[PDB]
Amino acid sequence: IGFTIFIPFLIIDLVIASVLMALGMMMVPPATIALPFKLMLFVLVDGWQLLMGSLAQSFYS
Amino acid sequence: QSWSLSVQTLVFITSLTFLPAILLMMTSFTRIIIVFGLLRNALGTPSAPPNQVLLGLALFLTFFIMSPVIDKIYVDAYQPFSEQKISMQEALDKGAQPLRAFMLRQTREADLALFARLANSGPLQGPEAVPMRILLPAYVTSELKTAFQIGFTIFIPFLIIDLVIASVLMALGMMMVPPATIALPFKLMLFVLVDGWQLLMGSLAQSF
């Protein structure tokens, strides 16, 4: 469950790094840019209600 | 009917063990501490103000925010209980009311609905039917979501400064410099010229 959880938060960092690299800003850290966007994602898609319901179903299924 | 004094002493001294849990889960400490941690992360330096200072400041802010609720509890529960006018259990039931109202006012509907679904609750009815064991986790979830909402928009101006400085530096030609190193003093300048601490406390207090 955790390792399928991990995938989108690394996808965002990957795309952030690629976009930063397109413009030649090779010395900009990607983690500092990606952290606010990861927080924004986890806010948008009901970060906790979906996770809570998924875990509860994962038990009752 | 009233509990014996030995039972009252046992319950009273046992309940003090849940004081950190009450402060964290049930009060405004969680949101303030999460916002403060996110702001340090956003400042460009991870441990500039020591954790001790932030923890004490968050405790003071929580006390100031919850002072009206504490006053209501004192008027309703503590004072008439200490004068030996109500029992311990009835005093606790009466004093749970203002804290329940405070928790409800900041609770997301979806969180409460979900945790009532998981607790087999059926015909709930009045907002004054939600039990404490259902209200508490919904309040915690809403607080976490609200803290994240505050943090990701606190992050915005520092990202703006970082991107502007990196773009200017690389477009000018010096692409071998680390933009964050040059950007950190400007992040501090922006934080001190806006009065970031004072305005942040004002916003955190107004969020309730």
């Binding site: - | 509907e109 609905a113 015909p123 709930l124």
Partner: protein
């Protein structure tokens, strides 16, 4: 409108827009079928699809308002009124018939 309305979709479509467009399309098709019934010359359907919540004290079920224009003198049968009610209620997830209002071109309430 209706299903055709959801064709030329620009990439910039907020979920909100998506939903509103779905509502419009459903309204259009329902009005269309209501015109198909013989006595009806034109129909207009308005849907109010809202938030659900959970507190049983304050629950607002979906609602519909249907205005029909009849052919000269083509009065609708009680059974007809019943069938319009059924169709509109079914087309809206969780629409309690009792929340469907049917009105004619003169402002007479045909339902209740």
């Amino acid at each position: 409108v209706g299903f055709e309305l959801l064709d030329q979709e620009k990439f910039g479509i907020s979920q909100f827009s998506e939903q509103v467009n779905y509502q419009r399309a459903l309204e259009g098709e329902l009005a269309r079928t209501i015109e198909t019934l013989g006595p009806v010359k034109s129909a207009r359907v308005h849907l109010a699809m809202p938030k659900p919540s959970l507190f049983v004290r304050e629950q607002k079920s979906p609602s519909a308002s249907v205005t029909v224009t009849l052919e000269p003198g083509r009065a609708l049968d009680e059974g007809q009124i019943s069938a319009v009610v059924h169709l509109v209620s079914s087309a809206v997830a969780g629409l309690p018939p009792g929340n469907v209002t049917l009105v004619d071109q003169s402002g007479h309430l045909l339902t209740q």
